């Protein structure tokens, strides 16, 4: 038996069912594009189960006794095993709606609702968007300007170089302040779409005004192509960095998040993901333990209290879960 919630089981970075999980995740993504949130979550959960299995699924008899494997997800896997291909998945892959929604939603600053609006309005290509600049936010204009680099996978080598410049800037602005790599790279991923850093300082309040100073330093080194600073709920800067490379450079998306140290463990847990892992952890918290978990805290709605955590381990323990290190949160 395998546990129901993704937060009750390890899900490693690498697994034995990548074809099958990829196919289910296409159907999940397509569901999300049509605003079908139930169906998205259902396909995502089924894919997550396959990622946690210790062996490849070679016959359909191997699906027995697994949670979150309803009829639809089972049929998809059956067709893949029997025929090498699933007609429904192939139809989605080839469909103009899916291809265009994927194209648009990938762009920096574009979500499903915006992409769907553009689709409905007859826009299909990146050139179409460039022909209608009045339809674009400044963030989206920047995403289009750099779209080729931003759809080139970010590599661990890029992350190391970025972490060095961010750490240098943070250390020069405020000795004692720290930078923690989060997101998929903290989970062990070799590649990604962006780089996530969480900044804090051990004395509560000493992080105030730090991010604009960090950004000034980075901007004055020529490292920033785009920056949008927002005070609000954590202070954050949504950035495109200009990463120097041997003979050239590439644009890379970087999010910088500042958390006061009291909230740091919650922020680190939240920002480390995976997105499905954290959704599952929050559902577990609410449904099984009666507590509301988010990136800022863990709230008991009946007692009107907040849990004091020094680490992620504290939070897992308080929720009655075995601790999972970040590399086992790849749900
Ligand atoms: N708690 C919380 N988490 C967030 C928020 N926004 C993003 N995250 C989480 C979900 C992600 O797993 C993680 C970083 O988001 P990403 O889109 O970078 O995902 P991740 O880095 O895991 O995959 P990637 O390889 O970058 O596509 O932070 C937020 O407002 N609150
Ligand atoms: Mg990331």
Q: What is the CATH number of the domain that holds 55?
A: 1.10.150.110
CATH of the domain at 189: 3.30.460.10
Residue by residue, DSSP assigns 171-189 as: HHHSTT-EEEE-HHHHTT-
Pair (162, 235) in one structural domain: yes
Tokens 């289009």 found at = 144
Residue by residue, DSSP assigns 138-181 as: HHHHHHHHTHHHHTSPEEHHHHHHHHHHHHHHHHHHSTT-EEEE
Pair (86, 159) in one structural domain: no
Domain of residue 6: give its range: 1-94
Ligand 1 binding residues, C-beta < 6 A: 183-184, 189, 192-194, 196, 270-271, 273-275, 295
Is 194 in the active site?
yes
Quickly count: other Cβ atoms within 10 Å of residue 161's Cβ. Answer: 17
Pair (169, 179) in one structural domain: yes
Pair (24, 75) in one structural domain: yes
Residue by residue, DSSP assigns 225-291 as: EEEEEE----EEEEEEEEEEETTEEEEEEEEEEE--GGGHHHHHHHHH--HHHHHHHHHHHHHHH--
Experiment used for this model? X-ray
Q: Which atom of ligand 1 is nearest to the CA of 274?
A: 12
The pair of three-digit structure tokens given for residue 203, joined into one six-digit string = 């004395």
Pair (250, 318) in one structural domain: no
Tokens 């969480």 found at = 198
Is 220 in the active site?
no
Q: How remote is the CA of residue 276 from the centroid of ligand 1, in Å?
A: 10
Pair (148, 215) in one structural domain: no
Q: How remote is the CA of residue 194 from the centroid of ligand 1, in Å?
A: 9
Max CA separation in the chain (angstroms): 61
Domain boundary among 135, 152, 169: 152
- Cα separation of 197 and 168, whole Å? 13
Pair (79, 47) in one structural domain: yes
* Alpha-carbon Rg for the chain in angstroms: 21
Domain boundary among 79, 94, 109: 94
Pair (168, 126) in one structural domain: no
- Number of domains present in the structure of the chain: 4
| CA-wise closest residue to 139 among 110, 161, 111 | 110
Helix (H) or strand (E) holding 200: strand 195-200
Nearest C-alpha to atom 2 of ligand 1 is from which residue?
270
Pair (124, 158) in one structural domain: no
Domain boundary among 231, 261, 291: 261
Pair (320, 306) in one structural domain: yes
- Cα separation of 181 and 256, whole Å? 10
CATH of the domain at 137: 1.10.150.20
- Cα separation of 245 and 132, whole Å? 33
Pair (314, 304) in one structural domain: yes
Residues 6+ apart with CB under 8 A from 38: none
């Amino acid at each position: 038996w395998m546990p129901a919630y993704a937060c009750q089981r390890p899900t490693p970075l690498t697994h034995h069912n990548t074809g099958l999980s990829e196919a289910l995740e296409i159907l999940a993504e397509a569901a999300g594009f049509e605003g079908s949130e139930g169906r998205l979550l259902t396909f995502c959960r089924a894919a997550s189960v396959l990622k946690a299995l210790p062996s490849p699924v070679t016959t359909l008899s191997q699906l027995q006794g697994l949670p979150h494997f309803g009829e639809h997800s089972s049929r998809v896997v059956q067709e893949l095993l029997e025929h090498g291909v699933c007609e429904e998945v192939e139809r989605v892959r080839r469909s103009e709606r899916y291809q265009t929604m994927k194209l648009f939603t990938q762009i920096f600053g574009v979500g499903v609702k915006t992409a769907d609006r553009w689709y409905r309005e007859g826009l299909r290509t990146l050139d179409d968007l460039r022909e209608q600049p009045q339809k674009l936010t400044q963030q989206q204009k920047a995403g289009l300007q750099h779209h080729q680099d931003l759809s080139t996978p970010v590599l661990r080598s890029d992350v190391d170089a970025l972490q060095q410049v961010v750490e240098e800037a943070v250390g020069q602005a405020l000795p004692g302040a720290t930078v923690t790599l989060t997101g998929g790279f903290r989970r062990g991923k070799l590649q990604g779409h962006d780089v996530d850093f969480l900044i804090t300082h051990p004395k509560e309040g000493q992080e105030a005004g730090l991010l604009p100073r960090v950004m000034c330093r980075l901007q004055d080194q020529g490292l920033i192509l785009y920056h949008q600073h927002q005070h609000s709920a954590f202070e954050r800067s949504f950035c495109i960095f200009r990463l120097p490379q041997p003979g050239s450079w590439k644009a890379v998306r970087v999010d910088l998040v500042v958390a006061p140290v009291s909230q740091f463990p919650f922020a680190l847990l939240g920002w480390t993901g995976s997105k499905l892992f954290q959704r599952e952890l929050r559902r577990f918290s609410r449904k099984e333990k009666g507590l509301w978990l988010n990136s800022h805290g863990l709230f008991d709605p009946e007692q009107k209290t907040f849990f004091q955590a020094a680490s992620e381990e504290d939070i897992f323990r308080h929720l009655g879960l075995e601790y999972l290190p970040p590399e086992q949160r790849n749900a």
